[PDB]
A paper describes a structure:
[name] is found in the biosynthetic gene cluster of the antibiotic viridogrisein and catalyzes methyl transfer to the C3 (i.e., β) position of α-ketoleucine (4-methyl-2-oxovalerate). The overall structure consists of a two-domain fold that assembles into homodimer in both the solution and the crystal. The N-terminal domain (I6 through H147) consists of helices that mediate dimerization, while the C-terminal domain (F149 through H338) consists of a Rossman fold. A single metal ion is located at the base of the C-terminal domain and is ligated by H244 and H296.
In order to provide further insights into the broader substrate scope and enhanced total turnover number of SgvMVAV, we determined its crystal structure in complex with SAH and 1a (2.04 Å resolution). Protein crystallography showed that although the three amino acid substitutions led to limited alterations in the overall structure, they resulted in a substantially widening of the binding pocket to accommodate larger substrates. Meanwhile, interactions between the protein, the metal ion and the bound SAH cofactor are sufficient to accommodate these dramatic changes in the active site contours with minimal perturbations to the overall scaffold. Taken together, the expanded substrate binding pocket and the retained overall enzyme scaffold allowed for a broad range of substrates to be effectively transformed, leading to a generally useful enantioselective alkylation biocatalyst. Further active site engineering showed that a single [name] mutation significantly improved enzyme activity (TTN = 1080). M144 resides in an α-helix proximal to the phenyl group of 1a. Ultimately, triple mutant [name] [name] [name] [name] (SgvMVAV) exhibited the highest activity, furnishing excellent yield and enantiomeric ratio (e.r.) of 1a (TTN = 1,410, 93% yield and 99:1 e.r.). Compared to wt [name], SgvMVAV provided a 235-fold improvement in TTN, demonstrating its substantially enhanced catalytic efficiency.
Author numbering:
A (entry chain A), B (entry chain A): 4 to 338
């Protein structure tokens, strides 16, 4: 009875916040694949009758899920068939983003590393990531750890036209357009799955007519820059690396094109990841992002120095790097 | 520059320990599937030359993985081709256990919930869990959150024979046998994949000749109790529920058989999960364990009361329940 109590206290300390985070991540990924999570908000209610119908789910099954999440403490039952997210839901979801990204989006790397180590080319085409999961997990991380700084920079200098390259689910644009009343946005992304997710999200935010989703590669922009011109700000979050080190020249043409297409006041903003940081706070997640990129995707992440170097030798001036909350995340501003 | 710093501090607080945990879980699951993690220990070294050969991996690929984990802060490079785990590695691995269990072992439930909601029978046979992942993730959680109390109870009363039903990777037995010099163990488990993992682990701990792994169902024990008799302690961790509510009678025969086969001093110890706790600490992970069991596996988790009730109406006396560190985990001792 003594040592049971001691084993209890010691175990609770060892486990720390991991039980809570493991449970939230699983409930939220499952609910997001169902389409339920888009209906969860601490300030709005989810009416099961309508949502079950909208999502084409048996209402009873939705109720059993929601009751499970209610037991977990992630939602509150407001009345019969009405639920709302717990007050700290957005932070819970943000943290789940990291877990979803490493454990869900990048699962093919985790499961099939042996293949990647022995025959990379065969592995790379056999074990492919689900870009809907890449884009969503990225959005959950972004909400609190990389969107806010870029949002605030974009909001000042009050743009009329914003282009986001490799936009994923288009959350940053939805946010920009929400904050500056007379703005248009174009979100560009190579993945059908991301684009479908985005169009849905954009519609859900009532901006379908203000914010266009165009399914194209960023490479496209080098030869067909007929999407940039008019833009006060061009943004690119975690995409530029997708053409390094293999398409260096294309990258430099996209950069040259960006410089041109800009209104005379505006800027390019690049959110991207720098490789293998050593500082205590950033190092562990930095290493995961770097290893997935380096080893599995064979994309080159550049250092701060290299990025600054490149934006200059692309004809941008006043280029600086800002530290983001997401480990090894950096914001580059090039005017 | 002001608001970048403010967005930084706010983002770091929002993210909390999630970046670190997400990265550790992914590195460790990946490394455990490779067979590397069994070689990681804060007190021993991993010699890449031998391990790469033992694991049938290109040594250079192992080195690149280990260097990534070193950058992450999870291993320390001792010299060329020598590495050891960071000092707090066991706690890191324990926490990764929770993430692995919810996000890896139970992945088929996360990805295919829609199917489970619409046609359960078809879903249950189409989307099946990898029991090697179930057993390993369970072991990582157990290390600090459910093995210690059962270990300490077993170690007292110094047994000669211990049987563990649904033993997974047999860590509890390996630990019991390690602490009481003249003990034999039998670990029983229905999953080939778990048994293979176990035999390997048992061999790695030099107990192959002391600890037998028998691939059988727990149901087996109802009709063929020729595995129990002689036992000072019978243990069963997170298996009993696998015959409820459908094989109630079989469960009661296994229980009756257990009562008989015991030496006159010994006891049955059951580690198992109670459903949907409400207390703040346990509720969130409790709900995940309960929802996976209830909804996806259709196994009945019993409350403390029900379990105590059952162990009595099986002819055990002096039955009590102890709180474990793993949320909604309970240890039942029946003599
Ligand atoms: N060559 C390419 N051209 C355009 N988009 C690309 C690309 N390679 C990858 N992408 C997209 O880039 C995104 C990377 S992650 C999502 C990033 C998003 N801007 C955000 O910050 O939340 C994915 O949506 C992926 O589909
Ligand atoms: N009907 C059954 N008979 C025997 N073992 C079973 C079973 N159903 C599931 N199992 C096994 O029970 C285990 C549940 S999880 C692992 C539990 C292990 N005792 C531990 O505490 O770490 C798995 O190894 C699974 O393969
Ligand atoms: O997945 C990719 O391809 C990326 O570029 C990852 C983008 C990212 C970076 C940090 C946290 C979450 C998401
Ligand atoms: O996966 C199963 O079937 C189980 O019974 C899970 C056993 C378990 C319980 C709590 C944490 C980790 C593992
Ligand atoms: Zn990337
Ligand atoms: Zn179970």
């Amino acid at each position: 009875h003594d040592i049971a109590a001691q084993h209890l206290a010691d175990g609770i300390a060892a486990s720390g916040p991991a039980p809570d985070l493991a449970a939230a991540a699983a409930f939220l990924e499952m609910g997001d694949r169902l389409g339920v999570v888009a209906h969860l908000d601490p300030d709005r209610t989810l009416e099961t009758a309508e949502v079950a119908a909208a999502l084409d789910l048996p209402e009873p099954a939705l109720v059993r899920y929601l009751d499970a999440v209610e037991s977990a403490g992630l939602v509150i039952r407001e009345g019969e068939g009405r639920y709302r997210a717990c007050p700290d839901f957005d932070t819970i979801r943000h943290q789940a983003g990291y877990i979803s990204w490493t454990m869900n989006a990048n699962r093919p790397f985790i499961e099939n590393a042996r293949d990647f180590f022995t025959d990379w080319d065969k592995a790379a085409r056999t074990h492919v990531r689900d870009y809907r999961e890449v884009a969503v997990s990225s959005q959950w991380v972004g909400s609190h750890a990389f969107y806010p700084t870029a949002l605030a920079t974009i909001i000042d200098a009050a743009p009329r036209k914003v282009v986001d390259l490799g936009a994923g689910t288009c959350r940053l644009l939805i946010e920009v357009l929400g904050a500056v009343p007379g703005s248009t946005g174009v979100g560009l992304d190579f993945a059908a799955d991301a684009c479908r997710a985005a169009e849905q999200a954009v519609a859900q935010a009532g901006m379908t007519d203000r914010l266009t989703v165009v399914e194209r590669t960023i490479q496209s922009v080098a030869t067909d820059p007929g999407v940039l011109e008019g833009a006060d700000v061009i943004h690119a979050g975690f995409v530029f690396h997708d053409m390094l080190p293999e398409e260096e020249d294309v990258c430099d043409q996209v950069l040259a094109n960006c410089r041109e297409s800009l209104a005379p006041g505006g800027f390019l903003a690049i959110t991207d990841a720098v490789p293998y940081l050593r500082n205590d706070r950033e190092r562990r997640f930095s290493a995961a992002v770097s290893y997935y990129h380096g080893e599995f995707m064979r994309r080159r992440l550049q250092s701060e120095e290299e990025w600054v170097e490149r934006l200059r030798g692309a004809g941008f001036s006043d280029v600086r790097a800002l530290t983001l909350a997401v480990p090894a995340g950096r914001l580059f501003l090039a005017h």
